[PDB]
Symmetry: C8
Subunit: 30 residues, 8 copies
């Protein structure tokens, strides 16, 4: 369904936030 589809797109975007934070953590290690 389209509402479940759209909530799965929200989950994917949250995972992109997680990956960006991981990239931030690597920059702080530097």
């Amino acid at each position: 369904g389209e509402i479940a589809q759209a909530l799965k797109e929200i989950a994917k975007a949250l995972k992109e936030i997680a990956w960006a934070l991981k990239e931030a953590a690597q920059a702080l290690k530097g």
Copy 2:
């Protein structure tokens, strides 16, 4: 539908947050 499209707009906005955090990560790199 209207509600699924609005949820998809929320996902896109979350992706824009991820891109902004990547810009932050890059700024820390130096």
Copy 3:
């Protein structure tokens, strides 16, 4: 509809968070 309208206002606010984070990233570059 008013619920879709309100979810689109949530998306707009999330984009304002993204823009604030971009401004933060520019400050870290400094």
Copy 4:
């Protein structure tokens, strides 16, 4: 309606988060 009005209150709160992050960005500027 009650639920749309509550979702609009959530959007306003997210905007307050954006303003707070702008204050953070300004504090980093110096």
Copy 5:
């Protein structure tokens, strides 16, 4: 209604996040 009530409690908690970020911004000014 109880669902609108609970969404207004979510808005209040988001405002508490905003206030904490403002306190963070003041600490960075220091």
Copy 6:
């Protein structure tokens, strides 16, 4: 009801995020 109670649990978790950010603000103060 079950759903309102779960939304209230989400609000409480967001408040715990606010408290953690206050701890971060205090750590920056020195």
Copy 7:
């Protein structure tokens, strides 16, 4: 119910974000 169950899992994940931020605050104290 499964939707209330899933919203309680979202609350638990938000508490894990709070705990991670507390760990961050301890690192800034250092």
Copy 8:
């Protein structure tokens, strides 16, 4: 159900955000 499963995917994504913030906390530790 589809919607509960999508909400559970959102919880998992939030947990990935928590793990990324823990990586950030560790990077600050030194």
